[PDB]
Amino acid sequence: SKGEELFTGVVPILVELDGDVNGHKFSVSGEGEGDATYGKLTLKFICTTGKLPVPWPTLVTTFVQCFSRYPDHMKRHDFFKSAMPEGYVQERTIFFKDDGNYKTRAEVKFEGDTLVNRIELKGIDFKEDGNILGHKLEYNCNSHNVYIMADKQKNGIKVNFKIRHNIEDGSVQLADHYQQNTPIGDGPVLLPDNHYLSTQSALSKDPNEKRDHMVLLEFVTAAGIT
Fold it and tell me: Known consequence of changing residue 171 to G?
């Protein structure tokens, strides 16, 4: 795989998002690096427009699966790296149970030696006093399985998973994710057999940062094929 070679070392990452949730407009810029050899991501995000109008955890999945660690025996199933450097379009609808939904369109590609994730996010039908606009979600992330299947129809993949956000009262806010990825370039890509990615994420704060922000440490490994 041509794209695979671009990830053998540490790669700088830039994330830029413009969002509008129930008319609340905001922007976020993130910076960090990824080391796919260890399925590792380290990033810091800053809301550049002021206060983030939704809870930071709800944006984690939106903020580069090309950094997932694919075991050597599963290398032929790594769609994400195969689309590089030209990149891929990643689209999602995220349904927050008993609340609104986010629709996102992103382009993930290299700009020079930097992997960039540019995203537009639109959220509608949120409840003013719900868990999202009401900021009732804990500042943490549970671990999940991300299910991947080929989508020959579009020379891409279809992805689905259920994120469970912890609510401060002890309950859980489900966020059902439906995702599609298609290559931007014309080069061939790897269409995978069914498998999944196992994720884990840790959120923290920079003690010296006064802007609204999020520090993220994440590990992701592909699995499901012997």
Answer: In GFPA; leads to enhanced fluorescence at 37 degrees Celsius. In Venus; leads to yellow fluorescence, improved maturation and reduced environmental sensitivity
